[PDB]
Design a protein around this ligand. Structure first.
Ligand SMILES: [Cl-]
Ligand SMILES: [Cl-]
Ligand SMILES: [Cl-]
Ligand SMILES: [Cl-]
Ligand SMILES: [Cl-]
Ligand SMILES: [Cl-]
Ligand SMILES: [Cl-]
Length: 279
């Protein structure tokens, strides 16, 4: 069904058209907090801001602002936090958010440097013996171990609230092979990656929402949540063919602007849902 639609769209060369339809129909809500002068250095891209209604609020007495959005997919029964790649001055805020929201997993869809350009701060420790302390938010972060595979890495991180000395194990799922240009030829690796995250238990309702990010937290990140949600709906719905990817994406864009940044990413999402459903 979705296969047929895909084939027709591919044949017609109309991905760019469908995508522009989505941009035109997308929700528009205020982002007043994100745009306050005092928050200028908390935003990686001035063009990418969380809506006020869905933004994640930090709990400590300071400025509560982080560029992150709660995407709550009611029918699919899953929530995600989408956020930008942390900046050098917001790494403490990032881990404060993970703590306060009770996240079990963090999903990273970029390399820290791509095409020789910085897309994200080095917000986790690369070496066991060199832990990170975030003094502003009073958190400690230690690399316990990592499982480096050919197309992704999973790291076992220990996050300690230095105030209470409570510790939590955070799983860091790092997809390291997203192409420098465009999207993956095949969704196979991306899909295997998604299934790994699912198998880990990180997406379970017993935990706080998974934190998903790329550089701006809308493009590859959008692809990840969109595919996951659509596959959920297909599995749950009485009539699995009734899942409309464009409608699902518009629903998600009620919670964060700009999800899926290109027609190629839209096409890739279709591809991934189709292939994933077969599995
Ligand atoms: Cl201000
Ligand atoms: Cl990296
Ligand atoms: Cl490449
Ligand atoms: Cl699942
Ligand atoms: Cl990115
Ligand atoms: Cl639908
Ligand atoms: Cl857009």
């Amino acid at each position: 069904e979705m296969e047929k639609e895909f084939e027709q769209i591919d044949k017609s060369g109309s991905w760019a058209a469908i995508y522009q339809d989505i941009r035109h129909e997308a929700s528009d809500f205020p982002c007043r907090v994100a745009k306050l002068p005092k928050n200028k250095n908390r935003n990686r891209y001035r063009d990418v801001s969380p809506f006020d209604h869905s933004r994640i609020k930090l709990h400590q007495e300071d400025n509560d602002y982080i560029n992150a959005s709660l995407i709550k997919m009611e029918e699919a029964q899953r929530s995600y936090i989408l956020t930008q790649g942390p900046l050098p001055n917001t790494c403490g805020h990032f881990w404060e958010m993970v703590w306060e929201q009770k996240s079990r997993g963090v999903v990273m869809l970029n390399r820290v440097m791509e095409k020789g350009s910085l897309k994200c701060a080095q917000y986790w420790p690369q070496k066991e013996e060199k832990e990170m302390i975030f003094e502003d938010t009073n958190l400690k972060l230690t690399l316990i171990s990592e499982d480096i595979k050919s197309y992704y890495t999973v790291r076992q991180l220990e996050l300690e609230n230095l105030t209470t000395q409570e510790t939590r194990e955070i799983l860091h799922f790092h997809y390291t092979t997203w192409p420098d240009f465009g999207v993956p030829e095949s969704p196979a690796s991306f899909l295997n990656f998604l299934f790994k995250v699912r198998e880990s238990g990180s997406l379970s309702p017993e935990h706080g929402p998974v934190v998903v990010h790329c550089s701006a937290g809308i493009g590859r990140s959008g692809t990840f949540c969109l595919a996951d949600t659509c596959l959920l709906l297909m599995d749950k719905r009485k009539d699995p063919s009734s899942v409309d990817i464009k409608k699902v994406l518009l629903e998600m864009r009620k919670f964060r602007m700009g999800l899926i940044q290109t027609a190629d990413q839209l096409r890739f999402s279709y591809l991934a849902v189709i292939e994933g459903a077969k599995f």
